[PDB]
Write an enzyme that holds these catalytic residues in place. Sequence first.
Site, PDB file in Angstrom:
ATOM      1  N   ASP A  34      23.315   5.158  -9.414  1.00  0.00           N
ATOM      2  CA  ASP A  34      22.971   6.508  -8.953  1.00  0.00           C
ATOM      3  C   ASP A  34      22.837   7.472 -10.118  1.00  0.00           C
ATOM      4  OD1 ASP A  34      22.542   8.769  -7.303  1.00  0.00           O
ATOM      5  OD2 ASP A  34      24.656   8.922  -6.765  1.00  0.00           O
ATOM      6  N   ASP A 221      16.409  10.929  -9.346  1.00  0.00           N
ATOM      7  CA  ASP A 221      17.580  10.447  -8.619  1.00  0.00           C
ATOM      8  C   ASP A 221      17.388   9.046  -8.003  1.00  0.00           C
ATOM      9  OD1 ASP A 221      19.846  10.202  -7.152  1.00  0.00           O
ATOM     10  OD2 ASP A 221      19.463  11.832  -5.788  1.00  0.00           O
TER      11      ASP A 221
HETATM   12  C1  LIG Z   1      20.333   4.903  -0.148  1.00  0.00           C
HETATM   13  C2  LIG Z   1      20.730   5.476   1.200  1.00  0.00           C
HETATM   14  C3  LIG Z   1      20.061   6.582   1.561  1.00  0.00           C
HETATM   15  C4  LIG Z   1      19.094   6.661   2.532  1.00  0.00           C
HETATM   16  N1  LIG Z   1      18.597   7.958   2.626  1.00  0.00           N
HETATM   17  C5  LIG Z   1      19.309   8.771   1.679  1.00  0.00           C
HETATM   18  C6  LIG Z   1      19.267  10.153   1.370  1.00  0.00           C
HETATM   19  C7  LIG Z   1      20.083  10.647   0.361  1.00  0.00           C
HETATM   20  C8  LIG Z   1      20.957   9.811  -0.354  1.00  0.00           C
HETATM   21  C9  LIG Z   1      21.846  10.392  -1.209  1.00  0.00           C
HETATM   22  O1  LIG Z   1      22.384  11.458  -0.823  1.00  0.00           O
HETATM   23  N2  LIG Z   1      22.299   9.729  -2.256  1.00  0.00           N
HETATM   24  C10 LIG Z   1      23.380  10.128  -3.096  1.00  0.00           C
HETATM   25  C11 LIG Z   1      24.179   8.811  -3.431  1.00  0.00           C
HETATM   26  C12 LIG Z   1      24.296   7.879  -2.266  1.00  0.00           C
HETATM   27  C13 LIG Z   1      23.717   6.592  -2.304  1.00  0.00           C
HETATM   28  C14 LIG Z   1      23.795   5.702  -1.241  1.00  0.00           C
HETATM   29  C15 LIG Z   1      24.443   6.043  -0.070  1.00  0.00           C
HETATM   30  C16 LIG Z   1      25.039   7.323   0.006  1.00  0.00           C
HETATM   31  C17 LIG Z   1      24.961   8.209  -1.106  1.00  0.00           C
HETATM   32  C18 LIG Z   1      22.943  10.921  -4.373  1.00  0.00           C
HETATM   33  O2  LIG Z   1      24.054  11.043  -5.216  1.00  0.00           O
HETATM   34  C19 LIG Z   1      22.404  12.327  -4.197  1.00  0.00           C
HETATM   35  N3  LIG Z   1      21.907  12.669  -5.495  1.00  0.00           N
HETATM   36  C20 LIG Z   1      21.476  14.055  -5.506  1.00  0.00           C
HETATM   37  C21 LIG Z   1      22.687  14.944  -5.395  1.00  0.00           C
HETATM   38  N4  LIG Z   1      23.598  14.475  -4.318  1.00  0.00           N
HETATM   39  C22 LIG Z   1      24.675  15.450  -3.893  1.00  0.00           C
HETATM   40  C23 LIG Z   1      25.697  15.525  -4.978  1.00  0.00           C
HETATM   41  C24 LIG Z   1      26.575  14.462  -5.189  1.00  0.00           C
HETATM   42  C25 LIG Z   1      27.504  14.519  -6.199  1.00  0.00           C
HETATM   43  C26 LIG Z   1      27.558  15.563  -7.068  1.00  0.00           C
HETATM   44  C27 LIG Z   1      26.666  16.603  -6.886  1.00  0.00           C
HETATM   45  C28 LIG Z   1      25.757  16.579  -5.847  1.00  0.00           C
HETATM   46  C29 LIG Z   1      23.503  13.256  -3.689  1.00  0.00           C
HETATM   47  O3  LIG Z   1      24.277  12.937  -2.792  1.00  0.00           O
HETATM   48  C30 LIG Z   1      21.058   8.470   0.004  1.00  0.00           C
HETATM   49  C31 LIG Z   1      20.216   7.918   0.984  1.00  0.00           C
HETATM   50  N5  LIG Z   1      18.298  10.907   1.966  1.00  0.00           N
HETATM   51  C32 LIG Z   1      18.529  12.289   2.448  1.00  0.00           C
HETATM   52  S1  LIG Z   1      16.666  10.389   2.120  1.00  0.00           S
HETATM   53  O4  LIG Z   1      16.359   9.505   1.010  1.00  0.00           O
HETATM   54  O5  LIG Z   1      15.783  11.414   2.279  1.00  0.00           O
HETATM   55  C33 LIG Z   1      16.610   9.346   3.557  1.00  0.00           C
HETATM   56  C34 LIG Z   1      15.310   8.569   3.680  1.00  0.00           C
HETATM   57  C35 LIG Z   1      16.633  10.167   4.829  1.00  0.00           C
HETATM   58  C36 LIG Z   1      17.657   8.312   3.635  1.00  0.00           C
END
Ligand SMILES: CCc1cn2c3c(cc(C(=O)N[C@@H](Cc4ccccc4)[C@H](O)[C@@H]4NCCN(Cc5ccccc5)C4=O)cc13)N(C)S(=O)(=O)C(C)(C)C2
Length: 371
Positions: A34, A221
Amino acid sequence: FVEMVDNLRGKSGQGYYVEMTVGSPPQTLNILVDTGSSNFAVGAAPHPFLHRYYQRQLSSTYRDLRKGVYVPYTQGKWEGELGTDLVSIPHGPNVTVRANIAAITESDKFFINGSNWEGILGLAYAEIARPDDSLEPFFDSLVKQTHVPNLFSLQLCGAGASVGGSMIIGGIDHSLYTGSLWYTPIRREWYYEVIIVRVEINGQDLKMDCKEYNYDKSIVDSGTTNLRLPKKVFEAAVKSIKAASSTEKFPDGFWLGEQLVCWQAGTTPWNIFPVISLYLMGEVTNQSFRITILPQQYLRPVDDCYKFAISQSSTGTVMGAVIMEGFYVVFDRARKRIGFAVSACHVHDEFRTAAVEGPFVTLDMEDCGYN
Ligand SMILES: CCc1cn2c3c(cc(C(=O)N[C@@H](Cc4ccccc4)[C@H](O)[C@@H]4NCCN(Cc5ccccc5)C4=O)cc13)N(C)S(=O)(=O)C(C)(C)C2
């Protein structure tokens, strides 16, 4: 570096993972890669979707940090207990590091049924680490404790069911891409933040204030599936993609990511879906380059059935896995820049190619950034 080629696996839409071990004796786990977060965390308690988990009891090298932690992601959240231990990447550099590890004891909508990973490797910077930026992320520990150079590269490949790729830790493997690498500045070291300065769909400029493209911010990302776009940009883009593909009709729940769309095997009409070019700020004055994305990237395969992998965001542009797929992406932390080239596993269309092209001239790129 040949030892790291093809060290990633995954299931489509459920991320890419690398094998690592934690503890002494080594306990083996699959860890999602990630670039959009900064915590290293592993399942450390039973869970219906975990085939295995980290057992702190069984490691002589485990050390409790007597501090809890939680991370809320855009999708799912977990909480647990901070500690350190020894970490290796078997198909990785030949080193062992003592790193912070969050042992996950509770979670909600984080682990994915059948994904085959049990943890997450946040490769972004300390500024967005939880509980705060004093928890040194894994790559920072790796670099500080070894002679591994301060950069990694990601080659995420689509189908060709199951997906694979490479994470090259410490450098660039020139057998994984063709043509030239094009670099965009890391705007700030928290996310891998970048600036998009222009967007075209089938060669037609969206003609928006380029600030909209980075409204809030833009990040690279690997932990997010979709290309995610700020509301105004998303709406402009879907409008243009509907109009390009208007010789067919789709439930607008398809456009929302809710419903599949299916065609008889081998008949998917790729030609009616546009290419999308994202222009990124370059390395010299008034200079940019573009990456061009094919519909085979943003129609994620699930007859032949697909989901629309472009969706809406309120936290900025997220250039997710389907954008990175087919590109070789260099996270050059040492020189504060992100490189893009056409991957060895690039996505094929009989009459169109994914490309990384430059130089372009673009005036006033600094205005595209948001404050
Ligand atoms: C792969 C599964 C998955 C499917 N989808 C989504 C998905 C998203 C995220 C997502 O979230 N990923 C996280 C890590 C994570 C990875 C696997 C499972 C849980 C989580 C990442 O880290 C993210 N990076 C930006 C800041 N942040 C917030 C943050 C975290 C930590 C510190 C600061 C900020 C994240 O969470 C994962 C998925 N979708 C919404 S979407 O692509 O469109 C969708 C098609 C609707 C579906």
